[PDB]
Amino acid sequence: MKEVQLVESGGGLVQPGRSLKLSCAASGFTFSNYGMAWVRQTPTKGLEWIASISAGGDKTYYGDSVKGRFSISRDNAKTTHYLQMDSLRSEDTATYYCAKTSRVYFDYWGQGVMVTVCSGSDYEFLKSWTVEDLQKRLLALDPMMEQEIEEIRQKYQSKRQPILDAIEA
Amino acid sequence: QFVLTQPNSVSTNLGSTVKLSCKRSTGNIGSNYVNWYQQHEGRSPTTMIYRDDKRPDGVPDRFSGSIDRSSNSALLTINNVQTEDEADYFCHSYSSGIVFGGGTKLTVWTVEDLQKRLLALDPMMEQEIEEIRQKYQCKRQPILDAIEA
Amino acid sequence: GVAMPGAEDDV
Ligand SMILES: [Ca+2]
Ligand SMILES: [Ca+2]
């Protein structure tokens, strides 16, 4: 009768070449009776399987993308499994989901946590600039962020509108 | 390792029957189990079909999976389509690795359910805005670091 | 029969 719940934690922003550790706390089942996995998603590339670790935790599997860079593990006495992510690349930017297995498929999925890897782009050119020149670049960068945020608000405000009037009367 | 190919987009009219296809590129579609996941906008995927054709409890009868070996494909059939079914659908299978299809995007109350639906938009919007904040924090930090120096 | 990689020990 227990509802299965998987909860990711960790993630966020990170530089390339550096590291991040994701966590998934699992509830509602006998943890060590089932494999755990990590699957990541982007809007254009869909779902990609990243890593799996067997029930007893003695066997690990990795997708081509992350072989030798990511390491999966689990602490059974803690009902948690981990994805250690090293040598991060820009293209590792994705929503990462944890997942439980049931022999032949993924039966339950986490909430998804966003990992943002910065470009490794060179910023040495900035040193010839003055504080005033550097501030003018900030004043140019923020209007472009604000435009992106405003188009999200508009996307959802047309989603809200029919619900809001259905409620009216 | 094989690939699972799904159409990018499918449209149907309400009440009709839609057949979402999932073709395997090499080897036999019937060699390994095929599963289907539904993902609504801003949400986690949930299982619609496991082991080729089994419905988890709570998945309505009008969802049914099958294997069409003649076209080396799996089919997620939806009878009497409702608007609530508009979502992304991913098939899934495996051999030595795990493979997901690219996903097919399908297009076609009382005050308490409406209120619940309205408020659910707020955490989804916030998550998208947070992604944007993190993206621009990457572009902003070299400038602020340059300023302190 | 063979289980999905990483699920070969599921009960
Ligand atoms: Ca200057
Ligand atoms: Ca606009």
Side-chain angles (χ1 to χ4, degrees), chain A residues 12-13 39 41 46-49 95 97 102-107 109-112 114 116-118 123 126 131 134-135 137-138 141-142 144-145 148-149 152-153 155-156 159-160 163-164 166-167, chain B residues 33 35 37 39 41 43-47 50-51 90 92 94 97-98 100-102 111 114-115 117-118 121-122 124-125 127-129 131-140 142-144 146-147:
Chain A
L13 176 148
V39 178
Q41 179 161 39
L47 301 162
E48 177 181 34
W49 163 74
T95 299
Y97 293 89
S102 188
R103 278 306 267 208
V104 299
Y105 72 111
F106 300 110
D107 57 342
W109 297 68
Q111 313 302 109
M114 184 73 199
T116 303
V117 187
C118 303
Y123 292 97
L126 290 175
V131 184
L134 294 165
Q135 298 172 321
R137 189 177 159 99
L138 293 166
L141 184 75
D142 279 57
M144 298 206 298
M145 180 181 77
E148 291 203 30
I149 298 185
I152 298 299
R153 296 194 166 113
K155 181 180 78 154
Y156 278 92
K159 293 191 190 130
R160 284 185 184 90
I163 312 172
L164 281 172
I167 286 162
Chain B
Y33 276 124
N35 315 286
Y37 298 96
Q39 183 178 40
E41 202 57 90
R43 293 273 60 179
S44 302
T46 64
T47 317
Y50 67 95
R51 297 177 180 261
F90 296 93
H92 162 268
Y94 56 90
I98 312 309
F100 289 93
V111 58
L114 290 170
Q115 280 301 145
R117 184 176 181 91
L118 175 72
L121 291 166
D122 284 336
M124 305 196 292
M125 189 180 76
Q127 185 57 46
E128 304 206 60
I129 297 179
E131 304 172 9
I132 296 171
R133 296 192 204 104
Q134 300 182 7
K135 188 213 309 186
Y136 279 90
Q137 197 176 334
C138 290
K139 309 163 185 303
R140 193 178 296 104
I143 316 188
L144 304 161
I147 283 169

Side-chain angles (χ1 to χ4, degrees), chain A residues 28-49:
Chain A
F29 60 95
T30 304
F31 187 62
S32 56
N33 281 351
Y34 298 99
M36 302 302 283
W38 292 88
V39 178
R40 70 182 172 190
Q41 179 161 39
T42 77
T44 310
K45 306 173 188 92
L47 301 162
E48 177 181 34
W49 163 74

Side-chain angles (χ1 to χ4, degrees), chain B residues 14 40 61 89 120 131:
Chain B
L14 202 145
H40 277 107
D61 77 313
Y89 294 87
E131 304 172 9

